[PDB]
Design a protein around this ligand. Sequence first.
Ligand SMILES: [Mg+2]
Ligand SMILES: [Mg+2]
Ligand SMILES: [Mg+2]
Ligand SMILES: [Mg+2]
Ligand SMILES: [Mg+2]
Ligand SMILES: [Mg+2]
Ligand SMILES: [Mg+2]
Ligand SMILES: [Mg+2]
Ligand SMILES: [Mg+2]
Ligand SMILES: [Mg+2]
Ligand SMILES: [Mg+2]
Ligand SMILES: [Mg+2]
Ligand SMILES: [Mg+2]
Ligand SMILES: [Mg+2]
Ligand SMILES: [Mg+2]
Ligand SMILES: [Mg+2]
Ligand SMILES: [Mg+2]
Ligand SMILES: [Mg+2]
Ligand SMILES: [Mg+2]
Ligand SMILES: [Mg+2]
Ligand SMILES: [Mg+2]
Lengths: 170, 181, 57, 244
Amino acid sequence: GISRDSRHKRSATGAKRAQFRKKRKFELGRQPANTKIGAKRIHSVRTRGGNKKYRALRIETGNFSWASEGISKKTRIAGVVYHPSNNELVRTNTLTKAAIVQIDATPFRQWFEAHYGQTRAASAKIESSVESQFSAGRLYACISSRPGQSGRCDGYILEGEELAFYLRRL
Amino acid sequence: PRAPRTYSKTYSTPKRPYESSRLDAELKLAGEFGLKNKKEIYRISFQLSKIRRAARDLLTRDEKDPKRLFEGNALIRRLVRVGVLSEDKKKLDYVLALKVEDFLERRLQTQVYKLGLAKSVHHARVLITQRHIAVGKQIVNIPSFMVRLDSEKHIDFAPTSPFGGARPGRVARRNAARKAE
Amino acid sequence: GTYRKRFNEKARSGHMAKLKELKRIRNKQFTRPNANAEILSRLKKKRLDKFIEHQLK
Amino acid sequence: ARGPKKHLKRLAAPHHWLLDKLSGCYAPRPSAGPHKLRESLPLIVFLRNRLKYALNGREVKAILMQRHVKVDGKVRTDTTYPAGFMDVITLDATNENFRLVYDVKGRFAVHRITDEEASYKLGKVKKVQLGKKGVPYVVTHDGRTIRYPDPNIKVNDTVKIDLASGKITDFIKFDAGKLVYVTGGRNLGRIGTIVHKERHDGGFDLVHIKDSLDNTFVTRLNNVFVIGEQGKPYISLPKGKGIK
RNA sequence: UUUACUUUGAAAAAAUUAGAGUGUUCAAAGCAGGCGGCUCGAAUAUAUUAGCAUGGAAUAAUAGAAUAGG
RNA sequence: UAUCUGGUUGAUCCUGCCAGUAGUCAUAUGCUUGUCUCAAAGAUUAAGCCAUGCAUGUCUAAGUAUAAGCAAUUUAUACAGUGAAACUGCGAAUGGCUCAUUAAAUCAGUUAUCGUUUAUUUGAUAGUUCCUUUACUACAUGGUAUAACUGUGGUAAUUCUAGAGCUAAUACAUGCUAAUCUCGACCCUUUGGAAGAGAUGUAUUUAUUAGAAAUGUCUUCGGACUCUUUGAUGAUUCAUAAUAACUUUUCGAAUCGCAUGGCCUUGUGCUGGCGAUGGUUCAUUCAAAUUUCUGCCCUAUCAACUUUCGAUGGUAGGAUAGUGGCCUACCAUGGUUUCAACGGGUAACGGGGAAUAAGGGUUCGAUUCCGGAGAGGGAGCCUGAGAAACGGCUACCACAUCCAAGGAAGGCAGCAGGCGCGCAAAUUACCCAAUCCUAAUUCAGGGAGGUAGUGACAAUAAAUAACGAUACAGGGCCCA
Ligand SMILES: [Mg+2]
Ligand SMILES: [Mg+2]
Ligand SMILES: [Mg+2]
Ligand SMILES: [Mg+2]
Ligand SMILES: [Mg+2]
Ligand SMILES: [Mg+2]
Ligand SMILES: [Mg+2]
Ligand SMILES: [Mg+2]
Ligand SMILES: [Mg+2]
Ligand SMILES: [Mg+2]
Ligand SMILES: [Mg+2]
Ligand SMILES: [Mg+2]
Ligand SMILES: [Mg+2]
Ligand SMILES: [Mg+2]
Ligand SMILES: [Mg+2]
Ligand SMILES: [Mg+2]
Ligand SMILES: [Mg+2]
Ligand SMILES: [Mg+2]
Ligand SMILES: [Mg+2]
Ligand SMILES: [Mg+2]
Ligand SMILES: [Mg+2]
């Protein structure tokens, strides 16, 4: 049913084009995978060639990266807070790329504690708002993967101008 | 399917076939050379027209042009080889002076008549079509065979022909058998 | 050639539906389940009009 | 079509093969292999229409699967194997070695060579790139990947490959004054020396070539194959030496 | 100065067309190799426009911190 | 509109006029039709409808035979020859036919993929030693399993199948087995030994990182002493490498034929040859998909069109093999047009080409080659590298086959052959043996193709008679 063909669209001049041919398989589309937070449910999709794609119907955990510290930890997902394209996805807690999400701070906190031994000092100094988030127990993160394609919820924590911008939008 | 193969018409109907001049010219030509019909004269006229149009187009071009030199030399060579064009006239200008009568002369029928193997043009046609004439070692049963200068001296009676040294034909041996009986 | 008469229009009713749909969009300026599922005349009326008014006249 | 084609009709076949238009309806479609379809000569054509050892198909097949034919020192059994430019075909039983080189007319010529010359070939360096694990390699015109190449080898250079081991013995850089062979176009088969390489960024590079007769002609760079330096080709040349 | 325009060079499948050779018994055709190095042989050509490279003095547009000011 | 004839009055001339007079090459049609070479077969704008038959299957020594199959044997001790059936692998997405629809669409030439998939072919490419429950299969793991087969059954009927019982893998699912490389103290001065400090695959996802005056001294006269250290494109966040984690997450040979060589501490010990089939990644090859610029018949008595239900653009997401309003959400109001947009007609598939013409031009091109679309009309899909497939599947519309009335089975614009009229036209022919294509494969298959047959399609050559003698008569022919 879903097709990506451009023939059905009107011409640039506005002319209504006629059907050149029947719909073709190589120009197909598939239903969206509205990934949601919950017990992991993934099913594979046989795609063009022998390749495969992974469909995240549900996922509750993902690998997130502290870029400033250059570390990566697996963390549970709390919930979607802000998505630039659709607020309805935020309302339904739908997971997609670029979505601003809340993640648990326990592993990053414990790693910080082990490495720096503080609840050296100059290096242990970190931006204020993310420290406030550590105090709260949840961190704002941006999903950098595409769960409907690779089946993963992997991303990076917000910081600096990024964090200030999304805080203003929140 | 298999690739197409080319074919072409060897003659063309004249522009006005009811000109009295054309009718009498054709009468003279057919009678002189024993031609079966007008399609032969049309064929020869078509060939001559093609040759003379080519020669005119060559004479248009500047002298020493590569195309003119090469293809004109080829045309003179072919015409002299067929014997139509004499050795002393190897120029395109004499090609434009050519005629149907000369190509008719180079026909095998006319040559079997001329060399003395036959007493008439029609007798020559009979002998050729009848399988009594051989050019060199090959039997030719086609009056329209165009003979070359070298092939001219090899026209003779075939080895298999009764006139060439073989046994008498069916009529002769039948009459001999009846006479003996 | 889009809307030519066909030999048997009934046999290709689906094709006709497309043509009417194309005609609708093309001339719009002038006007202004799942099969692979597991379980499934005028002159006379004018003439009378002229007569009756001629009577009522 | 809904997939790859598998049939080749005679009129659509390459002209240089010289296939009779009335012999049949189809022509031998070259199978996938080292060379392009249009720039390859399938073994069936070589054995039947050129060498005349075979009269027709299954006799070519039988010749092949007795393992008498070797292409670049390896036995091949596919009738439509796409042998191409500078391929060495060895027939041990008859004691013949051939190198596939176009003549001046532009068709592959039956050129007999000695065993010593048959021991090697030349490949135009189509690509030079680092592979996995930081391993350099060169891709030649016949699809041979040779790892660990000399650093001096660049694209458009010509590498002398030993057939037995498949390693580079020597190389020739692409520079003016080098002896060069044309492998396409209307000048296909001519031989000359480089004069200048006209460079156009974002476009096809053009090369000027001067023959021994001093006639000059220009050709696209993709159509250029270095074979040696002037007066010293690294291979034996057909009759005519790529003149006219 | 740039463009238009023009010269040449690549390119434009094969088949078809024109052309060279060849005693298919002739012809329509098909066809590329012969003698024991012989300087033997399709030598080949053909396409309006668009794109690419290239030589251009005229012609038609296009430009100037042109002959400016103190 | 030349040439030829005739009429224009009481006649003859010279003008002028009028009538007839011309190669066409397309359709239909009539008559005749001996030979050689040869070559084609459309048409009711009816892409209208089809009985019957065939047109795609395939096995090497080299995936799986206890067929209660056949034949063998030194008469068989895991098997071994040949091999039905079935599983497995591959192909069926090629070929052939037709021109319905289609007017910047297709198509022609010319570009790009630094914008993406790619079975197959060809060339390269993967020793990770170790890491407690070793309580240990690698001299090799399971049914988490079945066909063919045995046996019992249902239906009027079909290439319909139910229950129960068996048994295999290159089917399915699992899972292992004393290495190499840096320096190198110390001896020794080389063919050197090595105490010891160190390092260790792939596949997916994200983040980050790299990817730029030694002009001296000695020496044996050589050479040594210190330093260098990625490549490519016109152009990149390219190639490649590194760090940290991640994965219902892969791969890293539990496969097969032939043959029996070499070491010994003599063990059914160790090692070892020529091939086939598989497998990660890269390149190559056959391809596929988008894509850049120029070029389409008639119509202005079609002048404004597109945008509410995406039209132009921006951002983000989703989807795609991938770019992209391809779709979603929100934003702006954009886009084309008298240089003809938009709409309408087209007995419109496009081109290489064909006819005519002195040149310019005009017409045709379903039709032997390239490309595009389709399989009665729409819609949607499984499989597979590749299909929106139709001699694959599912629904709807129109037709239409069998029936025991409960159901079942359909797509000849494929090769022959019919209907569409009550008026008409190739053989329901033979061969896979010349060409090539498909398969596990020399061998099997191929209405692709070829052979022959059949209305003078279009073309070439060319018989139906030639040579004499004798007799009789004087008239024969041409102009006017
Ligand atoms: Mg006789
Ligand atoms: Mg096809
Ligand atoms: Mg480039
Ligand atoms: Mg047995
Ligand atoms: Mg199967
Ligand atoms: Mg229209
Ligand atoms: Mg295969
Ligand atoms: Mg069972
Ligand atoms: Mg929208
Ligand atoms: Mg049409
Ligand atoms: Mg056509
Ligand atoms: Mg199709
Ligand atoms: Mg039909
Ligand atoms: Mg398959
Ligand atoms: Mg379909
Ligand atoms: Mg069918
Ligand atoms: Mg089909
Ligand atoms: Mg038929
Ligand atoms: Mg056929
Ligand atoms: Mg009828
Ligand atoms: Mg096998």
